Ligand binder design. Structure first.
Ligand SMILES: *[C@@H]1O[C@H](CO[C@@H]2O[C@@H](C)[C@@H](O)[C@@H](O)[C@@H]2O)[C@@H](O)[C@H](O)[C@H]1NC(C)=O
Ligand SMILES: *[C@@H]1O[C@H](CO)[C@@H](O)[C@H](O)[C@H]1NC(C)=O
Ligand SMILES: *[C@@H]1O[C@H](CO)[C@@H](O)[C@H](O)[C@H]1NC(C)=O
Ligand SMILES: CN1C=CC=CC1=CNO
Ligand SMILES: CN1C=CC=CC1=CNO
Lengths: 532, 532
């Protein structure tokens, strides 16, 4: 039977799912690790013990325990990101969509979800792998991993909570794919890892980490980079936040062992309820429990690894959206609301800057404010709002990614850079938010091909082109069809620094993506902060 | 006789001069001080002892001893600024052009020449007062003052060389005008002082200095401001440069008295030959012997005076030229030449920045470079050259003047701001230099009305309009004719910050002259340099 697969861990039974007037096979909720529960909370994951009999892989698995966004109850804009399955610490599962008939040795794509390392689910409507699996004839895997304190509580030196365990979850699922995807018709030597935001930082982290490199062939990073200022902390900062979490829950703080024991007795929601209390600054776009620069998963600082070529050398495809910052300002910054135009006063602008660059002294804050203020028109509410949007997107997403592409490209085997700037016609978020963080994902997963979802014909065409870029890149290391008649997405090179826009217009090629602003964020401001 | 005037110092005899098919009276080379020679070198000036008989005031006087520009021998572009009379330390004279017939009580304008406080002459072709005196019916005075070490050698605490003596020369001539201009038909209660570059800084310095304020009614500042970074030094820096000048001439340095005695024995050219050796940095747009912030002529720092309203409150008219920096780059910066287009390499750009902001640490230098570099096109030779031109003009002229207008306007009685951006059609300097420092002067003095000088008809019209703005402002405190049909030059106000362009096109009104760049120079960079 097409729906039955014997793997090295045991037999699994899938389910036939309809897709665009046809069908494919789905194997949902396959375990890749032992449930990380009880005395295993905070521990490195352990491989799943093989099972006798047939694993029922017909239904989506539990999502990992996480903070749930209740800022706009009933609003689909925000609720589409929330867990749509019961939450459990027993959450280490993966999902596979397989073309029908079962292929023999086809290109594999493995999705790693974002969510700031504090949230995310493999089971979201917008991550449904069937359209891409069906349309491009790939085997589509989505994995899961522990988030929040569960995935990233870091007490370096301890072996009960060393940090990075959520990244090791991701690695274990990649190992499982390596070992077993052949039985689903996947080629384990042609696995592309891809992810958005924290999932894109994750992808870059597996490129960097010696223990992950051999498990995949190539990589796609959407709106996320391993060097993002929000994506990792030092071992000292991770420790401080773990102790502070303990302090919030009235834990004995005399030793790691006393602290960890206390944290292990708490119900999952008890950790989540105080998770946001441990941040060192009043800030936006900062999350509590994130990867830790530990000397193990990352052997040295991210910057020295990037500089020395200490990373996997392969092809990468990556890029950003036009308005990365708007989502985070809406949630944290004064003056921003969902149902107004959010014109921002000079005062709210000033306050926004401080929230956005929490680590800056006053000189640093002045430098940012000057760089992003039109002094001929400093009270223009639209300009101040859009300026903040750029500050947040440039600092947190675009300029770290640009630093990564420039460093990577000197040692890698081929870089393709995009700038996604089409706003979906059916977005329910306000217009001021523009082309929002995360709203290229639906195009990558081919949702615009579903007529009931009410996209335009031009948006279906853009989705088809994006899916085919991603899958062709996955197959060959080049998003372009050989000997094709369409416009060519050129290689990003050190010298010419080319990229393309992704939108509904005819492809345009540009150079030096946001270079003026990224020189400020990547060269000048760090030098300013170090000297003062 | 029209050409004979009894003054409080004695009788003077002038000369009838032709002007535009008519005639007026000129009284040239009237002494206002005792020759500052011998044991009086470096001393405050003394009033001229009255003379018996008739002073022959038919010919231009000697110019003060100064460095002579020999960078382009035979080239009129540079030679038109050099002394056109014999140089002497006996140089404290003034020149008066008087309408014919002699007026009874008319508006007076007193010109103070620029030249970096190290040079300048009252007798230049381009300072000939007859066109303005004749055309606008004003009494036009040009004074002189000691420059270089002669005017500005400063050993604070000593009474033999206290500093600022060149400013006191200017003050003595203003006192003489106060006391005596009535006899030439001038109204001593309606004297406008006006000057360019160091002469404009001078004008602002008399606005500030308690001992000068009562001697004039109102003021015009062209391309110069008292707070310019090149226009004054501290008492400690003035002392250091005086000692260093002594060191260059093998002087005994054991005391002020030993130093001054030695400097007094030297021939004038001996001081001039080593004058440029005393500058503390490799720099452009910095001059050796300049006004000193002494606690006497200036009772406190220029900035605290501006902040507290400690200055004469009256009407001012002032502004700048589009390309203030080009002249100084040509003379000092690598990569700039008179007979090429001077396209500037990235290297020469970097070097230019250091010359332009000599007082900056590396962070400061990075801040400037970032502010003025187009990072999408950083190797564009034209952009780098024009960028440097703006750096030099903004730092040294435009932004200090903008800081002055903003501070002054909060306490003053009416401000009119211009931006002169017409390049003379007959300029012999290369085109890359644009609308050069100093090339509005010829328009203010009405040279375009002289047909043999080969200006266009439109340039004669611009000259006439400028002369009439200046003279009407001098007469009434407003450059606009009451109940006139032409476009109105609006008041510069704290709130709206209006100015006009001066050129051959119909008047346009703008706001916030170079505000983006001036916020950088006036607010951010000083804060950066203080913190680092
Ligand atoms: C496989 O599971 C299918 C769907 O099952 C449902 O959800 C899971 C999580 C369980 O709670 C189960 O009791 C629910 O019915 C079933 O339709 C199907 O019978 C199962 N196939 C088997 C057991 O061979
Ligand atoms: C990638 O590697 C191959 C084989 O080593 C090489 O021939 C090719 O030029 C490389 N391509 C790029 C874009 O670096
Ligand atoms: C100047 O001073 C006069 C008299 O004190 C006053 O009436 C007038 O408003 C002032 N003008 C400006 C522009 O400040
Ligand atoms: C809320 N959320 C979670 C994961 C990825 C994106 C995201 C987005 N909003 O744009
Ligand atoms: C050389 N020189 C002297 C005084 C004023 C201006 C000047 C100018 N060049 O523009």
């Amino acid at each position: 039977s097409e729906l039955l697969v014997n793997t090295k861990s045991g037999k699994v039974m899938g389910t036939r799912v309809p897709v665009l007037s046809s069908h494919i096979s789905a194997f949902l909720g396959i375990p890749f690790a032992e449930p990380p529960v009880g005395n295993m909370r905070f521990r490195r994951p352990e491989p799943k013990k093989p099972w006798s009999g047939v694993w029922n892989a017909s239904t989506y698995p539990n999502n990992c325990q996480q903070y749930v966004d209740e800022q706009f109850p009933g609003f689909s804009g925000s609720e589409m990101w929330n867990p749509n399955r019961e939450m459990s610490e027993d959450c280490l599962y993966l999902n596979i969509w397989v073309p029908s008939p079962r292929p023999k040795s086809t290109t594999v794509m493995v999705w790693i979800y974002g969510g700031g390392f504090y949230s995310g689910s493999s089971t979201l409507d917008v991550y449904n792998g069937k359209y891409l699996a069906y349309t491009e004839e790939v085997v589509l895997v989505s994995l899961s991993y522990r988030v929040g304190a569960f995935g990233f509580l870091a007490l370096h030196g301890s072996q009960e909570a060393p940090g990075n365990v959520g990244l090791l979850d991701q690695r274990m699922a990649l190992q499982w794919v390596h070992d077993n995807i052949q039985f689903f018709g996947g080629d384990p030597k042609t696995v592309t890892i891809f992810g958005e935001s924290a999932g894109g930082a994750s992808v870059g982290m597996h490129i960097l980490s010696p223990g992950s490199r051999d498990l995949f062939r190539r990589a796609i990073l959407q709106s996320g980079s391993p060097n993002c200022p929000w994506a990792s902390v030092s071992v000292a900062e991770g420790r401080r936040r773990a102790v502070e979490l303990g302090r919030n829950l009235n834990c004995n703080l005399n030793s790691d062992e006393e602290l960890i024991h206390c944290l292990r007795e708490k119900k999952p929601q008890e950790l989540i309820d105080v998770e946001w209390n441990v941040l060192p600054f009043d800030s936006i776009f900062r999350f509590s429990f994130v990867p830790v620069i530990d000397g193990e998963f990352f052997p040295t600082s991210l910057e020295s690894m990037l500089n020395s070529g200490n990373f996997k050398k392969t092809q990468i495809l990556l890029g950003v959206n036009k308005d990365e910052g708007s989502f985070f300002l809406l949630y944290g910054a004064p003056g921003f609301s969902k149902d107004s135009e959010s014109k921002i006063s000079r005062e709210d602008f000033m306050s926004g800057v401080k929230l956005s660059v929490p680590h800056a002294n006053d000189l640093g804050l002045d430098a940012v404010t000057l760089q992003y203020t039109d002094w001929m028109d400093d009270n223009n509410g639209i300009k101040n709002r859009d300026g903040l949007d750029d500050i947040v997107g440039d600092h947190n997403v675009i300029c770290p990614l640009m630093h990564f592409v420039n460093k990577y490209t000197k040692f890698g085997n081929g870089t393709y850079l995009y700038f996604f700037n089409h706003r979906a016609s059916n977005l329910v978020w306000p217009e001021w938010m523009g082309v929002i963080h995360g709203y290229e994902i639906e195009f990558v997963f081919g949702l615009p091909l579903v007529k009931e979802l009410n996209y335009t014909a031009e948006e279906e065409a853009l989705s088809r082109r994006i899916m085919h870029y991603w899958a062709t890149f996955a197959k060959t290391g080049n998003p372009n069809e050989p000997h094709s008649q369409e416009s060519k997405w050129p290689l990003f090179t050190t010298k010419e620094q080319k990229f393309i826009d992704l939108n509904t217009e005819p492809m345009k090629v540009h150079q030096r993506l946001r270079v003026q602003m990224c020189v400020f964020w990547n060269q000048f401001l760090p030098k300013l902060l170090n000297a003062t």
